[PDB]
Amino acid sequence: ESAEEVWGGTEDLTSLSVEELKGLMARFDEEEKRISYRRRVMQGRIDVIRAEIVRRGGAVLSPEELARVLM
Amino acid sequence: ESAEEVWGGTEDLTSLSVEELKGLMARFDEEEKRISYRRRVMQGRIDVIRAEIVRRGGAVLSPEELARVLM
Ligand SMILES: [Mg+2]
Ligand SMILES: [Mg+2]
């Protein structure tokens, strides 16, 4: 019923009607956008945090640890 | 106790210890990675559906409706 279920319960792409594919695309395009928003929020948080740590002198964290988020 | 709450509840960035800074960066970084993976999955699906629709033709949709996902 949900896009996920329909998509998942399909073994053959060609069995899907155009109405289905249209509906699925819109659904996934919608989600993709909601997911990207979430990514950007995470990136912002990571961003603010890395600047705060750098502001304090980097602690004793090497530049590469800061850039790779190894901790 | 969850990162979501410690972070949502912080008024002043400078009030956060360095220990908790590192914890939050670590949590959000991994979250960022998981979210990016889903994005990529969605894009993979939109890609598969868009190819399928193109393959069939039928002028069901105009090039700009396929491209902007205007159903
Ligand atoms: Mg920055
Ligand atoms: Mg393709």
Author numbering:
A (entry chain A), B (entry chain B): 28 to 98
Paper quotes:
The RsiG–WhiG cognate pair is the only known example of a σ–anti-σ complex that is targeted by c-di-GMP.
Two well-diffracting crystal forms of the RsiGRr protein were obtained. The structure of the second RsiGRr crystal form was solved by molecular replacement (MR) and refined to Rwork/Rfree values of 19.9%/26.8% to 2.55-Å resolution. The same antiparallel homodimer found in crystal form 1 was evident in this structure. The Mg2+ ions in both apo structures are coordinated by D74, located at the C terminus of the E(X)3S(X)2R(X)3Q(X)3D motif. The presence of the same homodimers in both RsiGRr apo crystal structures, though they were obtained under very different conditions, supports that single-motif containing proteins can form the same antiparallel coiled-coil homodimer as observed in the monomeric twin-motif RsiGSv. Importantly, the finding also indicates that c-di-GMP binding is not necessary for dimerization of single-motif RsiG proteins. Interestingly, the regions that extend N and C terminal to the homodimeric RsiGRr central coiled-coils adopt short helical structures, which appear to depend on the crystal packing environment.
